[PDB]
Amino acid sequence: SHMSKAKFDKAVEIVQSLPKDGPIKPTQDEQLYFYKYFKQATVGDVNISRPGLMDFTGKAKWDAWKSVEGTSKEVAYQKYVEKLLEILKKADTEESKKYIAEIEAA
Ligand SMILES: [Zn+2]
């Protein structure tokens, strides 16, 4: 399905806005999911070599990004936005409902 860059950009702003400790909190796996589609949506296909074995954080991010090689920016937009909507719906607070509404109106 069609997803606009504008809705992606709003989703990114929201994701970046979330505190590490809060009622709306992506899991570790969900943050990797956001990461991989964020890179794929903006940079496109992974364009660097895998970090060294002892760069635990860096190599986990790289692996995620590499795993979506070949995905179009538009699918990346869609997957990113949809993951945030999933998370907001699961959080199910008046705050999360407001975020859903902002994405819808973007
Ligand atoms: Zn489209």
PDB file of N, CA and C and ligand atoms in Angstrom:
ATOM      1  N   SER A   1       0.813  -1.214   0.000  1.00  0.00           N
ATOM      2  CA  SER A   1       0.000   0.000   0.000  1.00  0.00           C
ATOM      3  C   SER A   1       0.852   1.271   0.000  1.00  0.00           C
ATOM      4  N   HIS A   2       0.312   2.319  -0.607  1.00  0.00           N
ATOM      5  CA  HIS A   2       0.968   3.614  -0.688  1.00  0.00           C
ATOM      6  C   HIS A   2       1.261   4.193   0.694  1.00  0.00           C
ATOM      7  N   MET A   3       2.493   4.648   0.890  1.00  0.00           N
ATOM      8  CA  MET A   3       2.828   5.424   2.080  1.00  0.00           C
ATOM      9  C   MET A   3       3.652   6.622   1.645  1.00  0.00           C
ATOM     10  N   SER A   4       3.266   7.807   2.109  1.00  0.00           N
ATOM     11  CA  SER A   4       3.960   9.039   1.753  1.00  0.00           C
ATOM     12  C   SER A   4       5.214   9.276   2.586  1.00  0.00           C
ATOM     13  N   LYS A   5       6.177   9.982   2.002  1.00  0.00           N
ATOM     14  CA  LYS A   5       7.357  10.388   2.752  1.00  0.00           C
ATOM     15  C   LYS A   5       6.936  11.229   3.959  1.00  0.00           C
ATOM     16  N   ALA A   6       5.886  12.031   3.800  1.00  0.00           N
ATOM     17  CA  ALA A   6       5.437  12.906   4.889  1.00  0.00           C
ATOM     18  C   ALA A   6       5.013  12.100   6.113  1.00  0.00           C
ATOM     19  N   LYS A   7       4.268  11.019   5.888  1.00  0.00           N
ATOM     20  CA  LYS A   7       3.847  10.197   7.018  1.00  0.00           C
ATOM     21  C   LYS A   7       5.048   9.476   7.651  1.00  0.00           C
ATOM     22  N   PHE A   8       5.973   9.010   6.816  1.00  0.00           N
ATOM     23  CA  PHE A   8       7.229   8.463   7.327  1.00  0.00           C
ATOM     24  C   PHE A   8       7.968   9.493   8.183  1.00  0.00           C
ATOM     25  N   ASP A   9       8.105  10.716   7.681  1.00  0.00           N
ATOM     26  CA  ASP A   9       8.864  11.731   8.414  1.00  0.00           C
ATOM     27  C   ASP A   9       8.187  12.050   9.762  1.00  0.00           C
ATOM     28  N   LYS A  10       6.862  12.090   9.777  1.00  0.00           N
ATOM     29  CA  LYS A  10       6.147  12.316  11.040  1.00  0.00           C
ATOM     30  C   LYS A  10       6.396  11.157  12.018  1.00  0.00           C
ATOM     31  N   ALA A  11       6.330   9.926  11.522  1.00  0.00           N
ATOM     32  CA  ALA A  11       6.612   8.755  12.343  1.00  0.00           C
ATOM     33  C   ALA A  11       8.021   8.820  12.955  1.00  0.00           C
ATOM     34  N   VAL A  12       9.008   9.202  12.146  1.00  0.00           N
ATOM     35  CA  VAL A  12      10.388   9.331  12.612  1.00  0.00           C
ATOM     36  C   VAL A  12      10.483  10.367  13.742  1.00  0.00           C
ATOM     37  N   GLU A  13       9.845  11.516  13.550  1.00  0.00           N
ATOM     38  CA  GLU A  13       9.830  12.553  14.574  1.00  0.00           C
ATOM     39  C   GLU A  13       9.266  12.008  15.880  1.00  0.00           C
ATOM     40  N   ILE A  14       8.187  11.237  15.775  1.00  0.00           N
ATOM     41  CA  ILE A  14       7.553  10.654  16.958  1.00  0.00           C
ATOM     42  C   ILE A  14       8.482   9.638  17.634  1.00  0.00           C
ATOM     43  N   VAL A  15       9.029   8.717  16.850  1.00  0.00           N
ATOM     44  CA  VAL A  15       9.928   7.708  17.382  1.00  0.00           C
ATOM     45  C   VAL A  15      11.120   8.357  18.089  1.00  0.00           C
ATOM     46  N   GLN A  16      11.705   9.371  17.456  1.00  0.00           N
ATOM     47  CA  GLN A  16      12.840  10.083  18.061  1.00  0.00           C
ATOM     48  C   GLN A  16      12.457  10.786  19.355  1.00  0.00           C
ATOM     49  N   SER A  17      11.167  11.062  19.505  1.00  0.00           N
ATOM     50  CA  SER A  17      10.630  11.844  20.616  1.00  0.00           C
ATOM     51  C   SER A  17      10.442  11.019  21.881  1.00  0.00           C
ATOM     52  N   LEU A  18      10.310   9.706  21.710  1.00  0.00           N
ATOM     53  CA  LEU A  18      10.012   8.804  22.823  1.00  0.00           C
ATOM     54  C   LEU A  18      11.186   8.682  23.802  1.00  0.00           C
ATOM     55  N   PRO A  19      10.911   8.839  25.108  1.00  0.00           N
ATOM     56  CA  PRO A  19      11.909   8.646  26.174  1.00  0.00           C
ATOM     57  C   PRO A  19      12.274   7.177  26.356  1.00  0.00           C
ATOM     58  N   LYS A  20      13.479   6.895  26.847  1.00  0.00           N
ATOM     59  CA  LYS A  20      13.894   5.506  27.041  1.00  0.00           C
ATOM     60  C   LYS A  20      12.972   4.813  28.040  1.00  0.00           C
ATOM     61  N   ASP A  21      12.534   5.567  29.044  1.00  0.00           N
ATOM     62  CA  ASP A  21      11.597   5.072  30.041  1.00  0.00           C
ATOM     63  C   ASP A  21      10.297   5.842  29.854  1.00  0.00           C
ATOM     64  N   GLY A  22       9.233   5.134  29.496  1.00  0.00           N
ATOM     65  CA  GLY A  22       7.943   5.766  29.288  1.00  0.00           C
ATOM     66  C   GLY A  22       6.860   4.756  28.973  1.00  0.00           C
ATOM     67  N   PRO A  23       5.602   5.212  28.950  1.00  0.00           N
ATOM     68  CA  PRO A  23       4.433   4.373  28.661  1.00  0.00           C
ATOM     69  C   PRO A  23       4.358   3.937  27.194  1.00  0.00           C
ATOM     70  N   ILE A  24       5.019   4.671  26.303  1.00  0.00           N
ATOM     71  CA  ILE A  24       5.095   4.261  24.904  1.00  0.00           C
ATOM     72  C   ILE A  24       6.537   3.896  24.600  1.00  0.00           C
ATOM     73  N   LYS A  25       6.820   2.600  24.612  1.00  0.00           N
ATOM     74  CA  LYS A  25       8.198   2.135  24.589  1.00  0.00           C
ATOM     75  C   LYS A  25       8.403   0.976  23.622  1.00  0.00           C
ATOM     76  N   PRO A  26       9.103   1.235  22.511  1.00  0.00           N
ATOM     77  CA  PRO A  26       9.453   0.145  21.596  1.00  0.00           C
ATOM     78  C   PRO A  26      10.387  -0.826  22.296  1.00  0.00           C
ATOM     79  N   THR A  27      10.231  -2.116  22.019  1.00  0.00           N
ATOM     80  CA  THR A  27      11.157  -3.114  22.538  1.00  0.00           C
ATOM     81  C   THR A  27      12.501  -3.017  21.817  1.00  0.00           C
ATOM     82  N   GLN A  28      13.487  -3.750  22.318  1.00  0.00           N
ATOM     83  CA  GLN A  28      14.798  -3.780  21.690  1.00  0.00           C
ATOM     84  C   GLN A  28      14.664  -4.222  20.234  1.00  0.00           C
ATOM     85  N   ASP A  29      13.905  -5.292  20.013  1.00  0.00           N
ATOM     86  CA  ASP A  29      13.657  -5.806  18.662  1.00  0.00           C
ATOM     87  C   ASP A  29      12.944  -4.773  17.788  1.00  0.00           C
ATOM     88  N   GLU A  30      12.010  -4.042  18.382  1.00  0.00           N
ATOM     89  CA  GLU A  30      11.272  -3.022  17.637  1.00  0.00           C
ATOM     90  C   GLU A  30      12.177  -1.845  17.240  1.00  0.00           C
ATOM     91  N   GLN A  31      13.156  -1.529  18.079  1.00  0.00           N
ATOM     92  CA  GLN A  31      14.074  -0.448  17.749  1.00  0.00           C
ATOM     93  C   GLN A  31      14.980  -0.848  16.580  1.00  0.00           C
ATOM     94  N   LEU A  32      15.406  -2.107  16.562  1.00  0.00           N
ATOM     95  CA  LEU A  32      16.165  -2.616  15.423  1.00  0.00           C
ATOM     96  C   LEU A  32      15.308  -2.573  14.153  1.00  0.00           C
ATOM     97  N   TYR A  33      14.017  -2.856  14.305  1.00  0.00           N
ATOM     98  CA  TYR A  33      13.094  -2.837  13.174  1.00  0.00           C
ATOM     99  C   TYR A  33      12.960  -1.412  12.635  1.00  0.00           C
ATOM    100  N   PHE A  34      12.767  -0.458  13.541  1.00  0.00           N
ATOM    101  CA  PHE A  34      12.745   0.945  13.148  1.00  0.00           C
ATOM    102  C   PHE A  34      14.061   1.350  12.486  1.00  0.00           C
ATOM    103  N   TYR A  35      15.179   0.898  13.051  1.00  0.00           N
ATOM    104  CA  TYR A  35      16.491   1.271  12.524  1.00  0.00           C
ATOM    105  C   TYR A  35      16.641   0.819  11.079  1.00  0.00           C
ATOM    106  N   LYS A  36      16.337  -0.452  10.832  1.00  0.00           N
ATOM    107  CA  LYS A  36      16.629  -1.027   9.529  1.00  0.00           C
ATOM    108  C   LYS A  36      15.795  -0.331   8.450  1.00  0.00           C
ATOM    109  N   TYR A  37      14.532  -0.043   8.756  1.00  0.00           N
ATOM    110  CA  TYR A  37      13.698   0.634   7.764  1.00  0.00           C
ATOM    111  C   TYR A  37      13.983   2.131   7.681  1.00  0.00           C
ATOM    112  N   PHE A  38      14.435   2.731   8.786  1.00  0.00           N
ATOM    113  CA  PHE A  38      14.877   4.112   8.717  1.00  0.00           C
ATOM    114  C   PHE A  38      16.038   4.270   7.727  1.00  0.00           C
ATOM    115  N   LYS A  39      17.060   3.427   7.858  1.00  0.00           N
ATOM    116  CA  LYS A  39      18.183   3.475   6.931  1.00  0.00           C
ATOM    117  C   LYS A  39      17.726   3.166   5.509  1.00  0.00           C
ATOM    118  N   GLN A  40      16.918   2.122   5.359  1.00  0.00           N
ATOM    119  CA  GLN A  40      16.474   1.696   4.030  1.00  0.00           C
ATOM    120  C   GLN A  40      15.624   2.776   3.344  1.00  0.00           C
ATOM    121  N   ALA A  41      14.888   3.545   4.147  1.00  0.00           N
ATOM    122  CA  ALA A  41      14.002   4.585   3.612  1.00  0.00           C
ATOM    123  C   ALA A  41      14.745   5.854   3.213  1.00  0.00           C
ATOM    124  N   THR A  42      15.905   6.073   3.818  1.00  0.00           N
ATOM    125  CA  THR A  42      16.613   7.326   3.637  1.00  0.00           C
ATOM    126  C   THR A  42      17.878   7.131   2.807  1.00  0.00           C
ATOM    127  N   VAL A  43      18.759   6.249   3.270  1.00  0.00           N
ATOM    128  CA  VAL A  43      20.002   5.947   2.556  1.00  0.00           C
ATOM    129  C   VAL A  43      19.787   4.938   1.421  1.00  0.00           C
ATOM    130  N   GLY A  44      18.900   3.981   1.655  1.00  0.00           N
ATOM    131  CA  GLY A  44      18.682   2.899   0.721  1.00  0.00           C
ATOM    132  C   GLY A  44      19.497   1.691   1.132  1.00  0.00           C
ATOM    133  N   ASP A  45      19.923   0.890   0.156  1.00  0.00           N
ATOM    134  CA  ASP A  45      20.672  -0.333   0.446  1.00  0.00           C
ATOM    135  C   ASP A  45      21.928  -0.059   1.270  1.00  0.00           C
ATOM    136  N   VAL A  46      22.232  -0.977   2.183  1.00  0.00           N
ATOM    137  CA  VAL A  46      23.399  -0.853   3.044  1.00  0.00           C
ATOM    138  C   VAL A  46      24.646  -0.541   2.215  1.00  0.00           C
ATOM    139  N   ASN A  47      25.401   0.468   2.648  1.00  0.00           N
ATOM    140  CA  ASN A  47      26.487   1.027   1.846  1.00  0.00           C
ATOM    141  C   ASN A  47      27.849   1.029   2.555  1.00  0.00           C
ATOM    142  N   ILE A  48      27.946   0.272   3.647  1.00  0.00           N
ATOM    143  CA  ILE A  48      29.196   0.134   4.395  1.00  0.00           C
ATOM    144  C   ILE A  48      29.434  -1.326   4.738  1.00  0.00           C
ATOM    145  N   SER A  49      30.677  -1.664   5.073  1.00  0.00           N
ATOM    146  CA  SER A  49      31.002  -3.020   5.502  1.00  0.00           C
ATOM    147  C   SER A  49      30.549  -3.241   6.942  1.00  0.00           C
ATOM    148  N   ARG A  50      30.359  -4.501   7.312  1.00  0.00           N
ATOM    149  CA  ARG A  50      29.916  -4.829   8.659  1.00  0.00           C
ATOM    150  C   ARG A  50      30.978  -4.398   9.659  1.00  0.00           C
ATOM    151  N   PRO A  51      30.551  -3.780  10.768  1.00  0.00           N
ATOM    152  CA  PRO A  51      31.508  -3.411  11.816  1.00  0.00           C
ATOM    153  C   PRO A  51      32.198  -4.641  12.393  1.00  0.00           C
ATOM    154  N   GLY A  52      33.268  -4.411  13.150  1.00  0.00           N
ATOM    155  CA  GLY A  52      34.015  -5.483  13.783  1.00  0.00           C
ATOM    156  C   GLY A  52      33.193  -6.281  14.780  1.00  0.00           C
ATOM    157  N   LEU A  53      33.683  -7.471  15.111  1.00  0.00           N
ATOM    158  CA  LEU A  53      32.946  -8.401  15.968  1.00  0.00           C
ATOM    159  C   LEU A  53      32.660  -7.835  17.361  1.00  0.00           C
ATOM    160  N   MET A  54      33.526  -6.946  17.823  1.00  0.00           N
ATOM    161  CA  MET A  54      33.398  -6.426  19.177  1.00  0.00           C
ATOM    162  C   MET A  54      32.560  -5.143  19.223  1.00  0.00           C
ATOM    163  N   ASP A  55      32.075  -4.707  18.065  1.00  0.00           N
ATOM    164  CA  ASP A  55      31.153  -3.580  18.021  1.00  0.00           C
ATOM    165  C   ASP A  55      29.744  -4.141  18.076  1.00  0.00           C
ATOM    166  N   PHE A  56      29.339  -4.582  19.264  1.00  0.00           N
ATOM    167  CA  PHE A  56      28.084  -5.311  19.429  1.00  0.00           C
ATOM    168  C   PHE A  56      26.896  -4.528  18.902  1.00  0.00           C
ATOM    169  N   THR A  57      26.791  -3.279  19.326  1.00  0.00           N
ATOM    170  CA  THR A  57      25.677  -2.441  18.897  1.00  0.00           C
ATOM    171  C   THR A  57      25.715  -2.188  17.392  1.00  0.00           C
ATOM    172  N   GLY A  58      26.885  -1.798  16.896  1.00  0.00           N
ATOM    173  CA  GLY A  58      27.048  -1.504  15.484  1.00  0.00           C
ATOM    174  C   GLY A  58      26.758  -2.685  14.576  1.00  0.00           C
ATOM    175  N   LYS A  59      27.219  -3.871  14.958  1.00  0.00           N
ATOM    176  CA  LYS A  59      27.036  -5.031  14.083  1.00  0.00           C
ATOM    177  C   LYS A  59      25.578  -5.510  14.075  1.00  0.00           C
ATOM    178  N   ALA A  60      24.874  -5.328  15.195  1.00  0.00           N
ATOM    179  CA  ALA A  60      23.459  -5.686  15.277  1.00  0.00           C
ATOM    180  C   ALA A  60      22.645  -4.780  14.349  1.00  0.00           C
ATOM    181  N   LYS A  61      22.939  -3.487  14.394  1.00  0.00           N
ATOM    182  CA  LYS A  61      22.305  -2.533  13.494  1.00  0.00           C
ATOM    183  C   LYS A  61      22.599  -2.864  12.035  1.00  0.00           C
ATOM    184  N   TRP A  62      23.857  -3.174  11.739  1.00  0.00           N
ATOM    185  CA  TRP A  62      24.244  -3.468  10.361  1.00  0.00           C
ATOM    186  C   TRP A  62      23.493  -4.695   9.844  1.00  0.00           C
ATOM    187  N   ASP A  63      23.488  -5.755  10.646  1.00  0.00           N
ATOM    188  CA  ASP A  63      22.784  -6.982  10.265  1.00  0.00           C
ATOM    189  C   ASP A  63      21.315  -6.704   9.925  1.00  0.00           C
ATOM    190  N   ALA A  64      20.656  -5.900  10.752  1.00  0.00           N
ATOM    191  CA  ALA A  64      19.251  -5.551  10.506  1.00  0.00           C
ATOM    192  C   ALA A  64      19.083  -4.828   9.175  1.00  0.00           C
ATOM    193  N   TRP A  65      19.892  -3.794   8.968  1.00  0.00           N
ATOM    194  CA  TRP A  65      19.889  -3.050   7.717  1.00  0.00           C
ATOM    195  C   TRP A  65      20.163  -3.963   6.511  1.00  0.00           C
ATOM    196  N   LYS A  66      21.199  -4.798   6.605  1.00  0.00           N
ATOM    197  CA  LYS A  66      21.541  -5.723   5.527  1.00  0.00           C
ATOM    198  C   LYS A  66      20.347  -6.628   5.203  1.00  0.00           C
ATOM    199  N   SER A  67      19.590  -7.010   6.228  1.00  0.00           N
ATOM    200  CA  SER A  67      18.476  -7.947   6.043  1.00  0.00           C
ATOM    201  C   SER A  67      17.320  -7.395   5.198  1.00  0.00           C
ATOM    202  N   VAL A  68      17.286  -6.081   4.997  1.00  0.00           N
ATOM    203  CA  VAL A  68      16.244  -5.487   4.164  1.00  0.00           C
ATOM    204  C   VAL A  68      16.783  -4.928   2.847  1.00  0.00           C
ATOM    205  N   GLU A  69      17.997  -5.341   2.485  1.00  0.00           N
ATOM    206  CA  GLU A  69      18.562  -4.956   1.200  1.00  0.00           C
ATOM    207  C   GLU A  69      17.581  -5.337   0.088  1.00  0.00           C
ATOM    208  N   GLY A  70      17.387  -4.440  -0.870  1.00  0.00           N
ATOM    209  CA  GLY A  70      16.499  -4.705  -1.985  1.00  0.00           C
ATOM    210  C   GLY A  70      15.104  -4.132  -1.789  1.00  0.00           C
ATOM    211  N   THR A  71      14.810  -3.673  -0.576  1.00  0.00           N
ATOM    212  CA  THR A  71      13.496  -3.096  -0.287  1.00  0.00           C
ATOM    213  C   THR A  71      13.413  -1.662  -0.792  1.00  0.00           C
ATOM    214  N   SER A  72      12.294  -1.316  -1.419  1.00  0.00           N
ATOM    215  CA  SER A  72      12.113   0.028  -1.961  1.00  0.00           C
ATOM    216  C   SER A  72      11.940   1.032  -0.830  1.00  0.00           C
ATOM    217  N   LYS A  73      12.222   2.301  -1.099  1.00  0.00           N
ATOM    218  CA  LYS A  73      11.980   3.315  -0.074  1.00  0.00           C
ATOM    219  C   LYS A  73      10.516   3.325   0.320  1.00  0.00           C
ATOM    220  N   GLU A  74       9.615   3.147  -0.641  1.00  0.00           N
ATOM    221  CA  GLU A  74       8.207   3.216  -0.273  1.00  0.00           C
ATOM    222  C   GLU A  74       7.773   2.087   0.659  1.00  0.00           C
ATOM    223  N   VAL A  75       8.268   0.878   0.426  1.00  0.00           N
ATOM    224  CA  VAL A  75       7.966  -0.198   1.360  1.00  0.00           C
ATOM    225  C   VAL A  75       8.574   0.104   2.736  1.00  0.00           C
ATOM    226  N   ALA A  76       9.782   0.657   2.735  1.00  0.00           N
ATOM    227  CA  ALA A  76      10.442   1.059   3.974  1.00  0.00           C
ATOM    228  C   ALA A  76       9.588   2.081   4.731  1.00  0.00           C
ATOM    229  N   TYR A  77       9.088   3.094   4.016  1.00  0.00           N
ATOM    230  CA  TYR A  77       8.154   4.065   4.606  1.00  0.00           C
ATOM    231  C   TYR A  77       6.980   3.354   5.257  1.00  0.00           C
ATOM    232  N   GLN A  78       6.381   2.435   4.508  1.00  0.00           N
ATOM    233  CA  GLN A  78       5.175   1.748   4.951  1.00  0.00           C
ATOM    234  C   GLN A  78       5.428   0.894   6.194  1.00  0.00           C
ATOM    235  N   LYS A  79       6.483   0.085   6.146  1.00  0.00           N
ATOM    236  CA  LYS A  79       6.827  -0.793   7.253  1.00  0.00           C
ATOM    237  C   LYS A  79       7.144  -0.010   8.530  1.00  0.00           C
ATOM    238  N   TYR A  80       7.853   1.104   8.379  1.00  0.00           N
ATOM    239  CA  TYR A  80       8.236   1.935   9.517  1.00  0.00           C
ATOM    240  C   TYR A  80       6.982   2.538  10.165  1.00  0.00           C
ATOM    241  N   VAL A  81       6.157   3.185   9.345  1.00  0.00           N
ATOM    242  CA  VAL A  81       4.924   3.800   9.853  1.00  0.00           C
ATOM    243  C   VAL A  81       4.017   2.756  10.505  1.00  0.00           C
ATOM    244  N   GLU A  82       3.811   1.644   9.813  1.00  0.00           N
ATOM    245  CA  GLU A  82       2.956   0.593  10.340  1.00  0.00           C
ATOM    246  C   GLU A  82       3.444   0.006  11.669  1.00  0.00           C
ATOM    247  N   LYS A  83       4.760  -0.142  11.832  1.00  0.00           N
ATOM    248  CA  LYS A  83       5.295  -0.627  13.099  1.00  0.00           C
ATOM    249  C   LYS A  83       4.982   0.352  14.233  1.00  0.00           C
ATOM    250  N   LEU A  84       5.130   1.644  13.964  1.00  0.00           N
ATOM    251  CA  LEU A  84       4.809   2.642  14.979  1.00  0.00           C
ATOM    252  C   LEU A  84       3.313   2.595  15.306  1.00  0.00           C
ATOM    253  N   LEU A  85       2.471   2.499  14.278  1.00  0.00           N
ATOM    254  CA  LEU A  85       1.028   2.423  14.535  1.00  0.00           C
ATOM    255  C   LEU A  85       0.673   1.202  15.380  1.00  0.00           C
ATOM    256  N   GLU A  86       1.298   0.070  15.071  1.00  0.00           N
ATOM    257  CA  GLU A  86       1.110  -1.156  15.835  1.00  0.00           C
ATOM    258  C   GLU A  86       1.420  -0.888  17.302  1.00  0.00           C
ATOM    259  N   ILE A  87       2.580  -0.286  17.542  1.00  0.00           N
ATOM    260  CA  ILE A  87       3.041  -0.013  18.898  1.00  0.00           C
ATOM    261  C   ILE A  87       2.120   0.962  19.635  1.00  0.00           C
ATOM    262  N   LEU A  88       1.660   1.996  18.933  1.00  0.00           N
ATOM    263  CA  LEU A  88       0.793   2.998  19.538  1.00  0.00           C
ATOM    264  C   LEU A  88      -0.544   2.364  19.882  1.00  0.00           C
ATOM    265  N   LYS A  89      -1.023   1.480  19.011  1.00  0.00           N
ATOM    266  CA  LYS A  89      -2.315   0.835  19.249  1.00  0.00           C
ATOM    267  C   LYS A  89      -2.243  -0.094  20.457  1.00  0.00           C
ATOM    268  N   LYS A  90      -1.131  -0.806  20.579  1.00  0.00           N
ATOM    269  CA  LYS A  90      -0.880  -1.691  21.709  1.00  0.00           C
ATOM    270  C   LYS A  90      -0.733  -0.912  23.026  1.00  0.00           C
ATOM    271  N   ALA A  91      -0.109   0.261  22.965  1.00  0.00           N
ATOM    272  CA  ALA A  91       0.045   1.102  24.155  1.00  0.00           C
ATOM    273  C   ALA A  91      -1.325   1.555  24.643  1.00  0.00           C
ATOM    274  N   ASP A  92      -2.164   1.968  23.699  1.00  0.00           N
ATOM    275  CA  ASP A  92      -3.574   2.195  23.964  1.00  0.00           C
ATOM    276  C   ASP A  92      -3.818   3.216  25.082  1.00  0.00           C
ATOM    277  N   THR A  93      -3.183   4.374  24.957  1.00  0.00           N
ATOM    278  CA  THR A  93      -3.404   5.480  25.883  1.00  0.00           C
ATOM    279  C   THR A  93      -3.937   6.680  25.107  1.00  0.00           C
ATOM    280  N   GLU A  94      -4.428   7.686  25.819  1.00  0.00           N
ATOM    281  CA  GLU A  94      -4.888   8.883  25.139  1.00  0.00           C
ATOM    282  C   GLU A  94      -3.720   9.545  24.430  1.00  0.00           C
ATOM    283  N   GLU A  95      -2.530   9.415  25.011  1.00  0.00           N
ATOM    284  CA  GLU A  95      -1.329   9.961  24.389  1.00  0.00           C
ATOM    285  C   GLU A  95      -1.028   9.239  23.073  1.00  0.00           C
ATOM    286  N   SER A  96      -1.050   7.909  23.095  1.00  0.00           N
ATOM    287  CA  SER A  96      -0.786   7.147  21.876  1.00  0.00           C
ATOM    288  C   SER A  96      -1.868   7.412  20.816  1.00  0.00           C
ATOM    289  N   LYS A  97      -3.115   7.580  21.249  1.00  0.00           N
ATOM    290  CA  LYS A  97      -4.184   7.900  20.304  1.00  0.00           C
ATOM    291  C   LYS A  97      -3.934   9.233  19.594  1.00  0.00           C
ATOM    292  N   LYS A  98      -3.399  10.199  20.333  1.00  0.00           N
ATOM    293  CA  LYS A  98      -3.050  11.495  19.775  1.00  0.00           C
ATOM    294  C   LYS A  98      -1.958  11.353  18.713  1.00  0.00           C
ATOM    295  N   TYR A  99      -0.971  10.499  18.978  1.00  0.00           N
ATOM    296  CA  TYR A  99       0.104  10.265  18.010  1.00  0.00           C
ATOM    297  C   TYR A  99      -0.426   9.608  16.746  1.00  0.00           C
ATOM    298  N   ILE A 100      -1.298   8.620  16.919  1.00  0.00           N
ATOM    299  CA  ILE A 100      -1.957   7.990  15.784  1.00  0.00           C
ATOM    300  C   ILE A 100      -2.672   9.060  14.952  1.00  0.00           C
ATOM    301  N   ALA A 101      -3.401   9.945  15.628  1.00  0.00           N
ATOM    302  CA  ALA A 101      -4.113  11.012  14.934  1.00  0.00           C
ATOM    303  C   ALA A 101      -3.184  11.943  14.145  1.00  0.00           C
ATOM    304  N   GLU A 102      -1.999  12.227  14.687  1.00  0.00           N
ATOM    305  CA  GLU A 102      -1.030  13.093  14.009  1.00  0.00           C
ATOM    306  C   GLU A 102      -0.469  12.431  12.761  1.00  0.00           C
ATOM    307  N   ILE A 103      -0.207  11.133  12.855  1.00  0.00           N
ATOM    308  CA  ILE A 103       0.241  10.372  11.690  1.00  0.00           C
ATOM    309  C   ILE A 103      -0.847  10.383  10.609  1.00  0.00           C
ATOM    310  N   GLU A 104      -2.058  10.147  10.986  1.00  0.00           N
ATOM    311  CA  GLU A 104      -3.182  10.146  10.041  1.00  0.00           C
ATOM    312  C   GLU A 104      -3.330  11.462   9.293  1.00  0.00           C
ATOM    313  N   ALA A 105      -3.070  12.556   9.973  1.00  0.00           N
ATOM    314  CA  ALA A 105      -3.273  13.882   9.404  1.00  0.00           C
ATOM    315  C   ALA A 105      -2.045  14.412   8.664  1.00  0.00           C
ATOM    316  N   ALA A 106      -0.961  13.641   8.689  1.00  0.00           N
ATOM    317  CA  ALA A 106       0.298  14.042   8.059  1.00  0.00           C
ATOM    318  C   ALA A 106       0.232  13.905   6.539  1.00  0.00           C
TER     319      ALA A 106
HETATM  320 ZN    ZN B   1       2.807   5.020  -3.439  1.00  0.00          ZN
END
